[PDB]
Write a protein that binds this ligand. Structure first.
Ligand code: 5YA
Ligand code: K
Ligand code: ZN
Length: 364
């Protein structure tokens, strides 16, 4: 029960890379982790494929059946737009098998936590937080985070979902916005015209779930210190108010300097501090990836974070391995922040934190 579970198989990695949208990302992430020999220090668990019934715990039968149908051949289906397919989510080959593989991997991790096999279980290929019950959205065919949380609900009465991806985790928040059993906390860029457009600090959930959604809207250019100060302030209060029994943590690396999104200016060290703070609660914790469009930097980030989970210090030099040539121009693990300004006004941040502190008092 001591060592983290690492969700992995060569078949799963090949499947995760098989669509080539973020080409070879899963292989690069695993290969760097392997290059640093971190997998030796972890319990490698082969993921299972999600069954129809498991996927149906969140997604509608109509959506799953459509996804399954357009997956048989290539397939332009008249119903595809209704289901969010055709643009960011093309209806490709075994798209359904891809979705079920990713959904299954996160469920497997969750089941490992339930069975007490580990206290931390990692699926770096999961974290597809935008998908809705009946619609693909924002590159997400299926919401594995929701599927993971719903699996955890078999055992845990209160689950905290923390989303540190650059984007608002609207899909997970919406799934649980009416219930107090799951609190969702998203730190994200929030700006008119920036996807997905939701998640202002006034977004607090609905009905019985009111005040169980927490949103921290942040502006371009935030760096490690300020981000950690915000994240720690919110998590300290969320922990006190909500007393979570299990945590699902999404760590999308599109906040990291050098990402094409070019919005936040974080390094993996700052995200690592937030992760450290969550790890100290010593709860069952399900670790997911997410966005991250600079491949080398994303691998850098999730590898570093795996080190944080294992309590290891990694060498600064990127080890010789399959993708060593992608790590230019410095070929080191550290990431240097970009020279552009932090657009966050300290008093605006403080007002947001106060508003959140106020909301969390209602949590009972
Ligand atoms: O990593 C991401 N989230 O975690 C992500 C990145 C970019 C976009 C995204 C941004 C803007 C417009 C879009 C229009 C259609 C589909 C996706 C869009 C959506 C999500
Ligand atoms: K987020
Ligand atoms: Zn994102």
């Amino acid at each position: 029960s001591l060592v983290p579970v690492y969700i992995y198989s060569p078949e799963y990695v090949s499947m995760c890379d098989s669509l080539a949208k973020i080409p070879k990302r899963a292989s690069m992430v695993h290969s760097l982790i392997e290059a640093y020999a971190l997998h030796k220090q972890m319990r490698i668990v082969k993921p299972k494929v999600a069954s129809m019934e498991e996927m149906a715990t969140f997604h509608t039968d109509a959506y799953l059946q459509h996804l399954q149908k357009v997956s048989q051949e290539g397939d332009d289906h008249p119903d595809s737009i209704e289901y969010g397919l055709g643009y960011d989510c093309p209806a490709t080959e075994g798209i359904f098998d891809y979705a079920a593989a990713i959904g299954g991997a996160t469920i497997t991790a969750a089941q490992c936590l339930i069975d007490g096999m580990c206290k931390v279980a990692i699926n770096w290929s999961g974290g597809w937080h935008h998908a809705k019950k009946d619609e693909a959205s924002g590159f997400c065919y299926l919401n594995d985070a929701v599927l993971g949380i719903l699996r955890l609900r078999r055992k845990f009465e209160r689950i905290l979902y923390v989303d540190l991806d650059l984007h608002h985790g609207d899909g997970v928040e919406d799934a649980f916005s009416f219930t107090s059993k799951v609190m969702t906390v998203s730190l994200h860029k929030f700006s008119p015209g920036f996807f997905p457009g939701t998640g202002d600090v006034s977004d607090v959930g609905l009905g019985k779930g009111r005040y169980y959604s927490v949103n921290v809207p942040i502006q371009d250019g935030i760096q490690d210190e300020k981000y950690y100060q915000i994240c720690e302030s919110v998590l300290k209060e969320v922990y006190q108010a909500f007393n979570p029994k299990a945590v699902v943590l999404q760590l999308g690396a599109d906040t990291i300097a050098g990402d094409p999104m070019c919005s936040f200016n974080m390094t993996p060290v700052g995200i690592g501090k937030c992760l450290k703070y969550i790890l100290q609660w010593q709860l069952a914790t399900l670790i997911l990836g997410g966005g991250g469009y600079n491949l080398a930097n994303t691998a850098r980030c999730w590898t570093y974070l795996t080190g944080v989970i294992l309590g290891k210090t990694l060498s600064s030099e990127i080890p010789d391995h399959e993708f060593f040539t992608a790590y230019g121009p410095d070929y080191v693990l550290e990431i240097t922040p970009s020279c552009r300004p932090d657009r966050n006004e300290p008093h605006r941040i403080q007002q947001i934190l106060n508003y959140i502190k106020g909301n969390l008092k209602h949590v009972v």
